[PDB]
Every structure is written in structure tokens, then in C-alpha cells.
């Protein structure tokens, strides 16, 4: 079993697109009743939905946030049913300390619904908590979720999908750096699996490769929806070899403080059979997720591990001898000091497929430093005249002193000394 | 749910115009019968009939009785409506501004989830700069965690109404800075000449450029009115802006304006709409942005616009150089977006238009206008002119000392803060 | 992706010609209504409406407004039409300089493919030529590098309303020699023969020749945009007409101007339009290339043409040994040829043909029209005649001589390079 | 495999007729599907071709130019479906400087294309390339893909089909000597085979002997097109001889720089008098005692080898040809496509290397030479930083083609 913590109006689409997805996926109708042909279903439904007393199905999904818009919208979209009312939150009415007071003001609540959702399911797996690393709402609420889930559920895996600020732009929010700092710094504390995603690169890839000129938030959300639920259905989806995102991630995560990966997978949200995919082969399509330009992020800077999984018709022996030719151009390279992997998963049974072989990566690549060497330079930028401080100072948490974020500051700091390291025996 | 309220002539028509343009937004009739958002700004009490959380005042009962007997009569609570810079706040304000408060309070119980009050007055009627004083002032003392937004109109730099507007600007903001939370001045000789050089008009009259102001504030307040795929509200707007407390008076903007013959004959192209906002003679305030550093900037679009497509068009207008920003902060925008378009008001000054922003940013020009403020305060205090008609409501030169030495030290600051 | 500049009465004539034959050519409504190829010319708005990259400036409102009140009035965008060489280029030209490029930089922010300028005018208007002198330095200091053809008109030596000519000239020619591309001259006096001559007008109306020239100008650029077997873009002919950075004024032509009657009296062979072309008789300037030599040409057809028919007809016809190129010039012609056929704006003069050209052969007698232009100039500075005119306005005999100079020094270029 | 690298719109065109061609012999549908009557066709389709899952063939073409109006025309026409999207590039937005500067600016996105489309082919043996040598797209373009793909695949034959300016008319470009002695260097310095094409010569046969008084680049490109798939039908149709490209080029270059060739094609019978018109400097396309070098014929549908022998025998008593006196031909077979029309009982094409080539070179040489003296058109050439300091690389690309001919010159004697 496992849970999803959606937060912000970031968190609550994406999730939104998720449980979109993947109901198509599984053939669920909109308002969370299984269609008739599906009676047989072969994949196991009940790693996210549960059979309801009524008989219906619904996702094991959390809500959160301080402001009524987004989840009143969703509430009136078409598949609110899918939804359970009571797996829903709102605040009675941006800065990571408020966040963090609302955490504080209604652990109650929150906790109820989350153990509620928990104590059900048999043989729970972890936490996936689907967020945005830069509104305030969702900064400081999803750091003391974290902070209190880990303090609860030492046994327990917890999953995040960050959505970093743009690089490319500045920063869609003005005292972004302050957010991302303080909720990176809980998530490299507390954080056991990562997926980190930056709005440049999303909308970088939504305008070159699916040349549609204003795809942004819907498509950029159908992406990283399909990313998420690829991982998620060569979990879900039975088979000999993978059957646990533990053993799955360990793969990945040579120590804990290490735990940010690298994604990529083949755009194909447009159904633009013409445009989209002429033609397709494991080889070419491994090739491409080496690229920069397939990722979704913005000093011989190497790999350290790489996991990819590939659908449809595949010939193992095409697959390793693919590899050799990879590892004889030498396009990409590993840690030194170092000593990869990839599975193979099914397809939704009645989900028409326009292709025959595609594949998403994940990668934890040291080259991911920059983004934490940018954000330290911006926070000390903001540090050197001292601005934009006032709104901190009504807050208790530092109404006395900032030693908190001082401390942050020198725990990222230690973390990209550790990353540039690695490389180095 | 936020509430609103409107101080001096200026005030009170910037409301109605507001008003006028939000019920056309929701299409509710002069009565407040429609043929949620709704609530955001509007009251629905036990019938249907709606009621908006409005309060305006004026000692001068025209303004009140005519708007009571205007076409939109039949909307506002009859009690709703409550009938020299000293007299504005000590002598007169300090009578009935109780009576303010206590309906304040009435209409601000009555809500659930406050968040804070719209303030609509001027900076040179005596009247209204002394009785907002006051009644911020109270308000702060009474209601301190709530947010406090200003939306005046700083004197034009060559065009004065009155003569004692630099009295009673320096009073008002010497009262003010510390409690105002972000206070969006807008000069109207900005919009005498946008207008004229936009939408093609001959005689500016003051209903036309109220309209536009409503415009704008409707602009500002559509991110909260209505659904968006990026979304703020009143915290967003008085923490992102306040790189001090001291410096919280951001411009104002709104570039797509054309008039329906010019309405056609181009695409409304989102990055040539923003280069617009930016360009310093589209700007909404008499003081050279070229001069002065954009410390921040926040932009609340609506209508359909599209995160791509504004990503490229802000990408576009930073590889220009003519715009800077200070050394210290290398990010600073705060964007915002809305499906809603804007709604044009029948047989109005604007067209209709399908994408719309309205940009919204701190500079330090303002420091210049500031120091051309003061040096005309320097003149008028070189006669101590008519100072008579202020000696006697319990002031002082002292208090003239003060507030003076309080806008160099301002001045000072921003001087420290280009730097 | 060219913008369209015009200057003067005959720049603004010329393009409401071009214009119309873009807009017949095209198939649009007089109000750019369509009932890609255009898509460099005219962009498209959300609707089904287009707009002219046009830029039209005069000093004098009445050709201004008499086009807004035209047939063509609303297919401009409002804004587009904004309203002795020392007057025109120092004193008032000036004073509209800033508000030409700022709508010049909203035009061409709309754009992303860039290319250069089309600028329009003629030596006769002082104001136009010292504005367009002006104009054209600002955008070379302003735009790095594109190119910046120029459809100028060259006036006679002897036929035209010569009173002030010879000064605008010298003065414009040195302006424009400083840091043009390449100016393509006319001559009124050529064209009243050649309409006279072969197409059999009695008294040709100024629109007439508008309208012959706007069809060149249409030859040349539309066989610039429309797709052929054998294309070409602007810097290909900014590269292939200019031997040396001085030398870039080729003359113009055109071979068919057969009225509708005679139109049946002939087969249209390529070779007899190529002889036509070389015919010394039916170019558009004054001049005999017999005493010159043809430095370089480019050759545009449009419409059934076969690029090994013209191959036999230019060999034919530079076998002819009366044609004298240098010994320096093995390879100096660029061929164009476009699938669609010339258009004939309905009523107009000219008559229909299957077929097309229009030439681009730079020359060297146009150093003789030189000569004697500046013979003329020293012979009416000699007096220094109605001169102060020019010394009021901010000029003096300095820039008199330091342009005689430089055009001297210009002529002396033209016979080396004739040797 | 192969891969076809087509710039300027001569290498667009070039390229859409080249496929048409193609499509047309190994009975491909418009679209890309496959005719029926085709289902069980014994011809290889590998060689420039790759079936997708929706069972059509994506032409192993990448598209590129300086401007959108050709390729924007192609994809407008019938045949538009067909190429694949991802391959084609347009530059966002006419001088050899500038299109190598150009070149450098967008090496990047090029070289990815190139590298998918050759990682998706096992047997690649080399590289064909269609441009025109006058107009500075195609000029620099090539010569920049030529510099790097020398630089970047040393063991992959690079094989190009040139077409050279019309000369006794003027050149259809002013700057066109500029643009052929640097793209003839480069060529020099890394080309592996040419086959040097001219429009003179070659709208000449066309109108004297097509009998078509009207050719417009449709029929001339269609005619190349032609010579093109006529060279590649053996190794696309394989036989028992000859069964490679490698065996083609080996057959004929005698020396590293000594490679260029000329072409024609008669049928445009007897094996003998076919052969026999495939000598005269009539039918050779392009347009003292200057000799061969290398013959080769290629003949289609059904052939004696006795008669290729007496024939052969028959004409080498007649000396029509020259040999090189200081050293020591070839006749191949193959056979016609199962689809178009045999309207021909027997067909021939000849691609030779004679040393008479020397003389466009010597044309071209005397060109930039006359330019040079007095430095006509070099004011944008400036422009480019390539040329921004001087223009060195125009002397030793000048010295470069001195040094070739006096090669040339030295292997016509013993
Ligand atoms: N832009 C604009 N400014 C207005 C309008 N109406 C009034 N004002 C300005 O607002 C200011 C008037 O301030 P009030 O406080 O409204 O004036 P009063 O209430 O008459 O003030 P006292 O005379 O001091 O009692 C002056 O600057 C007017 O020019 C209006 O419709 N539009
Ligand atoms: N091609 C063309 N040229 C014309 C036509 N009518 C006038 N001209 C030329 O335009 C010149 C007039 O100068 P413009 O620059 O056109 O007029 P202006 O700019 O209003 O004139 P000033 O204010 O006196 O400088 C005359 O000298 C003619 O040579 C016309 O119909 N066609
Ligand atoms: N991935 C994604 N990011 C978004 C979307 N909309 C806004 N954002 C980004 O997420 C952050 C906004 O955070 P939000 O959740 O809106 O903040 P809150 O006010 O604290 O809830 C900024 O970085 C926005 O750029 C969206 O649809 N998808
Ligand atoms: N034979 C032939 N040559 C062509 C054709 N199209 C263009 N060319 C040649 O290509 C050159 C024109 O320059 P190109 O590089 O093609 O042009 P650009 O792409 O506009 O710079 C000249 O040599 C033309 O003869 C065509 O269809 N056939
Ligand atoms: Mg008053
Ligand atoms: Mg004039």
C-alpha cells in the first residue's frame, strides 16, 4: 500500500492530473466506479485505490492548503467523486514560517486523516508527498508534515517531487530563496527519496519537442503526471523482478544524504503519431534519456547511478549488447571510485499504445550541485543587506533569532561539499 | 473575503467606478438580484439580494446623497455610507470616527475569513489625508495582525489641485509609513496622458479616469475574484513587495489599452503587452524609471494568458538592459495569472480585450519625487505660509520638524538602498 | 519579415500603390480581409485580420489624412501613420526622430525573422530627404547589422522642378553614402518616356507612375517572398550588387509595358524581354551605359519562365558585342524566378502578361549624372543663392565643402573602377 | 546503410526528387505504405530505407537550409507525409563566410540529428551529400558538415554530388568564385568521391537530346536524380559482382586527392552501341593530350557476356579512348527494378575519370585569381569573424587547387 500527500494548488493539479492518469490508466470511470470490461483487471488496483462500502474505489489521496480555490475547483470538476470527502482539508480562513505555524496549529486534524488512511492498509510501503518547493504554503506545511511523519514513522519511506523555482527566469516568487532553502534543508534532513523538478526545463522541453506554442501548466502537469505514474505502475504492476519501491530506490541511494535523483523520459502526451515518434528502438530511446535536453532540471561532473525501465516487446540480448555500444562511445560516464540497472514492465491492459518500446530514467548526477550553489549564492545575496526580513520577525519561530536558517545555510553548504566530493576518492 | 473602504471625493467615485465594474463582473443588477467568487467581495444575507462589504465617507454630504440618490441606489447598505490635514484628523475626524469604527466592526464580524482592508483616499484633500490617518491609525491599533493597503494618488509633479498638498501629504505619510502596509501611489496626470496618447479622448474628465483606476484595481484584486492556475492573496501581496517596511509605495501599471478602432489591427502579443507595462512612457507615475533601479516587481495577469508564454516574454525584456535591478537582489518578480479576462464596462473608454496584465513594481524615482515634495515643502516653509489655518487644531512646528526630518531620513534610506 | 518605410509625398504614394498591389495580389479585402507567402508583409491578428508592416512619416499632415480618409483607410493600424534638407534634418525632423523609432521598435518587436529595411523615398522634398538621412542614421547606429535597401528617386538633370534640388542631393547623397546598403534610382523623366513610348499614356498622372514603379517594386519583392525554382533574400542582393562599399546604386528596369491592344501583337520571348532590358532606351534613367560599363546585375522573373530559356536568351544577348563589361568581372549576374505571375490591379493601365522582370544593373555612367549634378551644385554655391536657409537651421559652408569633398572623392572611385 | 546530407535549395530539391525517384522503384506508397503487388518484393530496402511499426519506410534524408520557402514547398506536396519531421531542420530566420559561420553556431542540434540517424542503422557504409557549390547556404554548409564529419567519423566513405556554376553564360551568382574555390578546397581537403555536375552541360544534353525545349529544374534534378539511382542500383539490388560501395570507389580512385569523376546516362539496342554512346564527350554530363583515367559501365535487364566481351574486344581495336601511359577498365552488371516500365531493351551508364576536369578548375582558378587583383565583393566578407582579420584561408585554398592541378597535370604524363 501507499499514500499520497498533495500540497499547494501546485501539489493538489498535479495530483489532480495524477489520479486522472491513472484511472485512465486502469480503466476507472471519472466519478470512481470500475468499467464494465474491466471486471478482470489483472493489476493489482489496491496498491493506490480500495474498495469502498458501496463498492466503489477511491484513491488513498490527501488534500492540504490554506486557501479554498484550487480544491473547490477540483470539487466541482468532473471527477470530484473520485475523491473521498472526508480525505479533504481546508483552512478555516507566502512564507515558509507561516507554513510552518499552520503545521503546528493543526497536527490534530491532519494526523487523524493521515493514520485513519494509514491503519486500513495491511502492509503499507512509504510516502510519496507531491509538492512545490517555493510557495509558502507548501514550503513550510510539507517541511513539518516531514518532520512530524518521519518523528511518527521511523519504518516508513517517504518520496517527495519537488518542483524547483526557475533558473532560467527570476524567480516567480520574490522571497522564493528563503522557501527553497529552509525545505530543502528538511528534506536533505529528513527526506528519503527525491525527485526534483524545475519549471525551465519542464517548459523547455514542452515547447521544443511537443511544438505546441502555449502547452504550459496542463501539459507540463500531463509530464510530470505520466513520469510519476510510469514509476508507480512498474511498481503496482506484477511481476517477477521489482516488486518493491524500496528495493527499487536502494538501487539508487549509495547513503541517505545523497537521495536527489534525475529524470527523464520520452515525451508523449501529444497523440501526433506523425509528430510525435516516426520511429522507436530501446537503443535510441536509451540514448536520448542520456541527453540534458530530455531532462526535466536546468568539474568533470559524472553519474553515480542510473535506473531505467523500458515497456513493451524487448529483446534482452538487444538490451546488453545496446549497453556495450553505450559504454564503447563512452558518452556518459560513472564514479570513479565506484564499482547500472534496468527492468522491463508491462503496459495498461487496455490503454492503446502508439509505439512499442519507450523507457524512463532516473538519475542521481553530481552535476545537480549547481542548483545548490545558485540558491546559496541568491540566500547570501538576500543576507548581505538583510531585506525582506520584517514578515519573519512577527513570527515567533523567529521572532527571537535566525539561527534556524544560519543553520540551514551551513547544512546545505556541507551537502554540496559532499557532492563535489564524491566524485573524488 | 476582504472588505473595503473609501475616504475623500476621490475615494468615494474610485469606489463607485469599482463597484459598478465588479457587479458587472458578476452581472448583479443596481438592486443586487443576479439574473464562490461571489462572496469574495459580496454579502448574500438570508434572501438572495446581495450586499458588497463597502463603507465610504465624506464631510461634504453631496457626494454621499447623490450616489445615495444615484443609479445605484438600491445596492449599498443605507448605513453603509458615513457622511486642512488637522481638521481631517483631530478636530472633525476624532467626533465621528468612532461611529466609523463601530460600523467597521459590524460588517467585519459578520465575514469569517479576513484578511484585510482596502484603503481608497488622496494625499492632498485635507479631509480625507487627515481622517484616513486617524482611521488606520485606530485600525492598526485595534486590528494590528491585518494586512493595510493604500491606493492614493501622489501629487503630479507640475499639476497641483489645491495648495497645501504638500502639508498634507508630509502629515499623512509622517502618520502613516510605519502602519500603511504597501501603498500603490498613482499619479493622475499619468493618466491624462496615457489616456490621451491610448485611447484617443480629448477632454479627460474625472469619471473617465475613475473608471481606469477601478480597472486597475480590479485588475489587482482578480487574482483573488476568481480561480487562476497561479494564484495570491493580500499576504502575498505586502510580503513580496516589503523589502523594508519603510519602503513599501510600488507604482502602478495596466499596458493593453486601446480603444475598440484600435482594438483590431494587432494580436495583442503577451510579450510585446509586457515590454509595454515596462516602457517608461506607458508608466503610471510621473518619475523617470531609467532613473531608478526596479528593486521589485509584481505582475498579476488575467484572462488567457499562459505560463510559457510569459516566461518568454519576461526572458525577452530581461535580455534588454535598459532595465536594472539592485545588485543585492537577483529575483524579484511575483507572477500572477487568471482565466478571467477583464470585462469591458458598456459604452465605456476601453475595449474589449482578451489578455490583460497589470505590472506593479518599487523604484527609486519615487526617492526623486520625494525630494521634489520636499523642496516645494521647503518653499512653503520659507513663508510659514497660512500655517494659521493649523496652528490652532493642536499641532506644532515641532510636529512640522519631525515629519520633515522623518522624509529626509526616508529619502536617505532609499539613497542607502540604491546603493 | 521586411519593414516598409516611406518618406515625403512620393513615399507616401508609392506605398498606398505597393500596398494595393500586395493586398490585390494576395487576394484581400480593401479592409485586409481574406476571402506563409504574405505572412512576411502581413502579420495576422486573433481575428482574420491582417496589417501592413507599414511606417509612413511626413511633416505635412494633408497626404496623411487624405490616406486615412481612402479606400484603404482601415487597413492601417491607427498608430502606424504618424505625421529644404537643413529644415528637415535638424530642427523638426529631430523632434519626431524619438517618437518614429519608438512605433519603429514596436513594429519590429512583433517580429523574429528579421531581414532589413524596404525605406521609401526622394531626393525632391528637402524635409523628406533630410528626415529620411535622419531616420536612416538612427537606425544604422540603433540595429547592428541588417540591411537597408533603398527605393529612392533620382530627379533629372535637366527636366525637373530644379530650384533647390541640387543641395537636398549632395546633402542626402552624403548622409546616405556614410552608412547605406544599396539605392536603387529613378527618374521621373525616364518614366514619362517610357509610359509615352510603349504603353501610350498622353498625360501619365503622378498615380500612374505610382503605379508602374509600385509594380517594379512588387516584381522585386514579391519574387523576394514567394517560393520559386530559383529564390534569393535580401543580404543576397545587399552582397551580389555591391562591388565596394561606395559603389551600390544600380539603375532599375522592367521589360513589359505593353498596353492591353498590343498585348496580342507579340510572344513574349524571354530573349526579346532580356533585349528590352539591355535596350538603352528602356531603362529608367538617364544615362547612356555605352559609356559605361555594367558592374554587376540581378535578373527576377516571375511567372512561366524556364531557367535554360533564359540561360540561351542571356547568352544571346551579351554576345552582342555592343555590351562592354570590365575586365575584372568574369561572373556578374544573379537570376531569379518565382511560380507566381505578375497581377494587374483591375482598371489599371498596364496589361496582363504571362511573364516578368526586373533588373538590378549597377552601371558607371550614373558617375557622369554624378559630374554633372555636382557641377551644378558648385555653379549654384558659387553665389551661395538662397543660402541662408540652409545656414539658419544648423548647417554651414563647412558641410557644403566637406560634402563636395566626398562626392568627388566618390566620383574619382567611379572612374578607377572604370578603368 | 547509407545517409543523405542535402543543403541549398539545389540539395532540397535534389533530395525531393532523389526520393521520388526512389519511392517510385521500390514501389512505395506516397504515404509510406507499401503496395500490395510490393508485399512480397525480393529488392532490399535497407540500403535507404528503415520500415517503422505502422509497416511505412522513413527516408534515411535530413533536410537542412539557411531559409523555410523550399522545405515549407515540400511539405506541401503529396510526398510531404512521408519524410520525418524530427530529421528536417529550418533556420529560425547568401555568402560562403557566413554560412561556415552559421555552421558553427548550430553544430550542436545538427550533429545530434546525424547521430540518431546513424545509431539506428547497423551496416552504414559511408555518406552521400547533394549541394550546390555558388550560393553560400550550400557552400559553407557543406563545408562545414565536411570539416566535421572528417573530424568526427574517420571510417565512413563521404560522397558528394556537386553542381557547379554555368560558366560560358555568367555564373548565376557574382560571388560565386569565392564560395566554388573554397568549397573545391575543402572538398580536396577531406570529400572521399565526387561527382562534379554543371547546368550548362547538362541543360544542354537535356534540350538536344530530351527532346524538351522547356526544362525547368523539375526535369534537370529529375535527370540527376536519375544518374544518382542508376549509380546506387547494384549495391541497393544485390548481385554477385560489386556488391558494395567500397567496391565502386576502389574500382576507380587511383590516389588520395586524384577523385573526381564525371557521369551520363544514354537512354535518357545493343550492349555494344550503348557503351559505345556512353564515350563521347557528348553524353559525358559535365561540360595536351588529356586522357583517362577509370571506366565503368553499369547495364540493366538482360546481358550477354559474350557480347560485353566481343563488343568490349571490338571497340578496344578502334582506340576511341586514351589510357594513361605510365599505368594499366570495368564493365558492370546488374539488374532493373521489377516495377517501372522496361521501355528500353538494354540501358547504359558510365561513371569515368578523365583528366580534361582539370580545365573548370583552371576556369575557376583564373576567376578568383581576376577578383583577387583587384578584391571585388569582399566587404561583407569581412563581416564574418572567419574573415575578420584577413583572408588567409583564401590563398591556401587557391594554392591548395594549384597544387591539384599540377597533380593532375603531372599524372597525364608518365
Ligand atoms: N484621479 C482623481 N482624483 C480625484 C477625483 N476626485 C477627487 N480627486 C482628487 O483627490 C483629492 C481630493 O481629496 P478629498 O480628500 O477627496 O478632498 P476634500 O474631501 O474635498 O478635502 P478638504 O478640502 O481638505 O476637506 C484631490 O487631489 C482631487 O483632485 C477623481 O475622480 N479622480
Ligand atoms: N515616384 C513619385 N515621386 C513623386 C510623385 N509626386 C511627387 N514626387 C516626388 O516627390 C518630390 C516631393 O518631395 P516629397 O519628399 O515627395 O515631399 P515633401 O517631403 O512633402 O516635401 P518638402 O516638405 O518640400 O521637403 C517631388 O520632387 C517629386 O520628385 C509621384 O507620384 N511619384
Ligand atoms: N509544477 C507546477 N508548478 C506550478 C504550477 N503553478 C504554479 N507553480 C509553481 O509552484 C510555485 C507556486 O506555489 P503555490 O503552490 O502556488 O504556493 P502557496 O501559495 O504556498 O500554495 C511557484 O514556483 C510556481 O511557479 C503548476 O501548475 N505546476
Ligand atoms: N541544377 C540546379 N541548381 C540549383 C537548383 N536550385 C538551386 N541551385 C543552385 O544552387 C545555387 C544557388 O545557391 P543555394 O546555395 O542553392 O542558395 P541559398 O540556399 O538561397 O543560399 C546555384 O548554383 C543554383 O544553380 C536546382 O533546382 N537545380
Ligand atoms: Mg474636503
Ligand atoms: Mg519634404
Same mark, same amino acid.
Given at each position: 500500500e501507499i499514500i499520497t500527500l498533495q500540497l499547494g494548488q501546485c501539489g493538489n493539479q498535479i495530483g489532480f492530473e495524477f489520479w486522472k492518469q491513472l484511472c485512465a490508466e486502469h480503466g476507472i470511470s471519472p466519478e470512481g466506479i470500475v468499467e464494465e470490461f474491466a471486471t478482470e483487471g489483472t493489476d493489482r488496483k489496491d496498491v493506490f485505490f480500495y474498495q469502498a462500502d458501496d463498492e466503489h474505489y477511491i484513491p488513498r489521496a490527501v488534500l492540504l492548503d490554506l486557501e479554498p480555490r484550487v480544491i473547490h475547483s477540483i470539487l466541482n470538476s468532473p471527477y470530484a467523486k473520485l475523491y473521498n470527502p472526508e480525505n479533504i482539508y481546508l483552512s478555516e480562513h507566502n512564507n515558509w514560517a507561516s507554513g510552518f505555524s499552520q503545521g503546528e496549529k493543526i497536527h490534530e486534524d491532519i494526523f487523524d486523516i493521515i493514520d485513519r488512511e494509514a491503519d486500513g492498509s495491511d502492509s503499507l510501503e512509504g510516502f510519496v508527498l507531491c509538492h512545490s518547493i517555493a510557495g509558502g504554503t507548501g514550503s513550510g506545511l510539507g517541511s513539518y508534515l516531514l518532520e512530524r511523519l518521519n518523528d511518527r514513522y521511523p519504518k516508513?519511506?517517504?518520496?517527495?517531487?519537488?518542483?524547483?523555482?526557475?533558473?532560467?527566469?527570476?524567480?516567480?516568487?520574490?522571497?522564493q530563496p528563503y522557501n527553497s532553502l529552509l525545505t530543502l534543508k528538511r528534506l536533505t534532513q529528513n527526506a528519503d527519496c527525491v525527485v526534483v523538478l524545475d519549471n525551465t526545463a519542464l517548459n523547455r522541453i514542452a515547447t521544443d519537442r511537443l511544438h505546441i506554442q502555449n502547452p504550459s501548466f496542463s501539459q507540463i502537469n500531463q509530464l510530470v503526471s505520466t513520469i510519476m505514474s510510469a514509476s508507480t505502475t512498474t511498481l503496482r504492476y506484477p511481476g517477477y523482478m521489482n516488486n518493491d519501491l524500496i528495493g527499487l530506490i536502494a538501487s539508487l541511494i549509495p547513503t541517505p544524504r545523497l537521495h536527489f535523483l534525475m529524470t527523464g523520459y520520452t515525451p508523449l502526451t501529444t497523440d501526433q503519431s506523425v509528430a510525435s515518434v516516426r520511429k522507436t528502438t530501446v537503443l535510441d530511446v536509451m540514448r536520448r534519456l542520456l541527453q540534458p535536453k530530455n531532462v526535466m532540471v536546468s568539474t568533470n561532473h559524472c553519474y553515480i547511478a542510473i535506473l531505467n525501465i523500458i515497456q513493451g516487446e524487448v529483446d534482452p540480448t538487444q538490451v546488453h549488447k545496446s549497453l556495450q555500444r553505450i559504454r564503447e562511445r563512452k558518452?556518459?560516464?560513472?564514479?570513479?571510485?565506484?564499482?547500472?540497472?534496468?527492468?522491463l514492465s508491462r503496459k495498461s491492459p487496455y490503454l492503446p499504445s502508439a509505439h512499442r518500446v519507450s523507457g524512463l530514467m532516473m538519475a542521481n548526477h553530481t552535476s545537480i550541485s549547481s542548483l545548490f550553489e545558485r540558491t546559496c549564492r541568491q540566500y547570501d545575496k538576500l543576507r548581505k543587506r538583510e531585506a525582506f526580513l520584517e514578515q519573519f520577525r512577527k513570527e515567533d519561530m523567529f521572532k527571537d533569532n535566525f539561527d534556524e536558517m544560519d543553520t540551514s545555510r551551513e547544512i546545505v553548504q556541507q551537502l554540496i561539499d559532499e557532492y563535489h566530493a564524491a566524485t573524488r576518492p | 473575503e476582504c472588505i473595503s473602504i473609501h475616504v475623500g471625493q476621490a475615494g468615494v467615485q474610485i469606489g463607485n467606478a469599482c463597484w459598478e465594474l465588479y457587479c458587472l463582473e458578476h452581472g448583479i443588477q443596481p438592486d443586487g438580484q443576479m439574473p464562490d467568487s461571489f462572496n469574495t467581495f459580496f454579502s448574500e444575507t438570508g434572501a438572495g439580494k446581495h450586499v458588497p462589504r463597502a463603507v465610504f465617507v465624506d464631510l461634504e454630504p453631496t457626494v454621499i446623497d447623490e450616489v445615495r440618490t444615484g443609479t445605484y441606489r438600491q445596492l449599498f447598505h443605507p448605513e453603509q455610507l458615513i457622511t486642512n490635514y488637522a481638521r481631517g484628523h483631530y478636530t472633525i475626524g476624532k467626533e465621528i470616527i468612532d461611529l466609523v469604527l463601530d460600523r467597521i466592526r459590524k460588517l467585519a464580524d459578520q465575514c469569517t475569513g479576513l484578511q484585510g482592508f482596502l484603503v481608497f483616499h488622496s494625499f492632498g484633500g485635507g479631509t480625507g489625508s487627515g481622517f484616513t490617518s486617524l482611521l488606520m491609525e485606530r485600525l492598526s491599533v485595534d486590528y494590528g495582525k491585518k494586512s493595510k493597503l493604500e491606493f492614493s494618488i501622489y501629487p503630479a509633479p507640475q499639476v497641483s489641485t489645491a495648495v497645501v498638498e504638500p502639508y498634507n501629504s508630509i502629515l499623512t505619510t509622517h502618520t502613516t509609513l510605519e502602519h500603511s502596509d504597501c501603498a500603490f501611489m498613482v499619479d493622475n496626470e499619468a493618466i491624462y496622458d496615457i489616456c490621451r496618447r491610448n485611447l484617443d479622448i480629448e477632454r479627460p474628465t474625472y469619471t473617465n479616469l475613475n473608471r481606469l483606476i477601478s480597472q486597475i484595481v480590479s485588475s489587482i484584486?482578480?487574482?483573488?475574484?476568481?480561480?487562476?492556475?497561479?494564484?495570491?492573496?493580500?499576504?502575498?501581496?505586502?510580503?513580496?513587495? %516589503?523589502?523594508?517596511?519603510?519602503?513599501?509605495?510600488?507604482? $502602478? !501599471?495596466?499596458?493593453?489599452?486601446? =480603444?475598440?478602432?484600435?482594438?483590431?489591427?494587432?494580436?495583442?502579443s503577451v510579450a510585446e503587452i509586457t515590454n509595454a507595462c515596462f516602457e517608461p512612457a506607458n508608466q503610471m507615475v510621473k518619475c523617470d524609471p531609467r532613473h531608478g533601479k526596479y528593486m521589485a516587481c509584481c505582475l498579476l495577469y488575467r484572462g488567457? %494568458?499562459?505560463?510559457?508564454?510569459?516566461?518568454?516574454?519576461? $526572458? !525577452?525584456?530581461?535580455?534588454?538592459? =535598459?532595465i536594472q535591478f539592485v545588485d543585492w537582489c537577483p529575483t524579484g518578480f511575483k507572477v500572477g495569472i487568471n482565466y478571467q479576462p477583464p470585462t469591458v464596462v458598456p459604452g465605456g473608454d476601453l475595449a474589449k480585450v482578451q489578455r490583460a496584465v497589470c505590472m506593479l513594481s518599487n523604484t527609486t524615482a519615487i526617492a526623486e519625487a520625494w525630494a521634489r515634495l520636499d523642496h516645494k515643502f521647503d518653499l512653503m516653509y520659507a513663508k510659514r505660509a497660512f500655517v494659521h489655518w493649523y496652528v490652532g487644531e493642536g499641532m506644532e512646528e515641532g510636529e512640522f520638524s519631525e515629519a520633515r526630518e522623518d522624509m529626509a531620513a526616508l529619502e536617505k534610506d532609499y539613497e542607502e538602498v540604491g546603493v
Open positions: 516508513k519511506l517517504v518520496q517527495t517531487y519537488s518542483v524547483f523555482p526557475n533558473q532560467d527566469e527570476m524567480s516567480d516568487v520574490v522571497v558518452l556518459a560516464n560513472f564514479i570513479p571510485w565506484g564499482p547500472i540497472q534496468v527492468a | 484584486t482578480a487574482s483573488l475574484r476568481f480561480d487562476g492556475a497561479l494564484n495570491v492573496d493580500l499576504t502575498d501581496f505586502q510580503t513580496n513587495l %516589503v523589502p523594508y517596511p519603510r519602503i513599501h509605495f510600488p507604482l $502602478a !501599471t495596466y499596458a493593453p489599452v486601446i =480603444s475598440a478602432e484600435k482594438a483590431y489591427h494587432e494580436q495583442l488567457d %494568458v499562459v505560463p510559457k508564454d510569459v516566461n518568454a516574454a519576461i $526572458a !525577452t525584456i530581461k535580455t534588454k538592459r =535598459s
